[PDB]
């Protein structure tokens, strides 16, 4: 499978999440995603085929994971935006007020601005601290997906949002959205991963 930020993958033939970013760890191929998407050694499938397994994760507290892929997978420096792509250029963290977009299998590619950093999300499982908040909308299934600026700087991976009964927060004004992502930089240094860029 071609590994592109934002595309769907399943975990143990049951939950769905979205790919965050292609990375490598030495000769190993992988992608970063959200920790709540699977436990260590859970099987990741893309389009019905096994692509790898969860190598490590931390959830709750933090919300991060990376999946190590088989050699057969093609890692790409790109994030899905409809039928087009945004090239990943690096991971400079953007400041509050910066515009950012996110990509995932439920709502597609959505843009907004970063509104606050170091937010705590209180999920049923426990608190997750240190999240950045944006007001781009998102829906159930988008977890793990890419948050990236138009200039191609990877920001982090989708964690959670104030979903309404329709499964997303796209039907409420941007002003009322709290869509949270886990910053990319701590995930890259915690697992010794290098981002695939183009």
């Amino acid at each position: 499978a071609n590994i592109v930020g934002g595309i769907e993958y399943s975990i143990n033939n049951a939950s769905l999440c979205s790919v965050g970013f292609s990375v490598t760890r030495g000769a190993t191929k992988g992608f970063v995603t959200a920790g709540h998407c699977g436990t260590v050694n859970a099987t990741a499938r893309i389009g019905g085929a096994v692509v790898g397994t969860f190598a490590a994760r931390v959830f709750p507290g933090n919300d991060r994971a990376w999946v190590s892929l088989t050699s057969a997978q093609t890692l790409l420096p790109r994030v899905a935006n409809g039928s087009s792509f945004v090239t990943v250029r690096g991971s400079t963290e953007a400041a509050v007020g910066a515009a950012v977009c996110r990509s995932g299998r439920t709502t597609g590619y959505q843009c907004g601005t970063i509104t606050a950093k170091n937010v705590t999300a209180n999920y049923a499982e426990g608190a997750v601290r240190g999240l950045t908040q944006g007001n781009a909308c998102a829906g159930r299934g988008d977890s793990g997906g890419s948050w990236i600026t138009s200039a191609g700087q990877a920001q982090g991976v989708m964690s959670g949002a104030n979903v309404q009964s329709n499964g997303n927060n796209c039907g409420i004004p941007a002003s009322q959205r709290s869509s949270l992502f886990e910053r990319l930089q701590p995930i890259l240094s915690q697992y010794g991963l290098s981002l695939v860029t183009g």
Binding site: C17, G141, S159, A161, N162
Partner: peptide, 4 residues
Amino acid sequence: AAPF
């Protein structure tokens, strides 16, 4: 907010 809920996970996703």
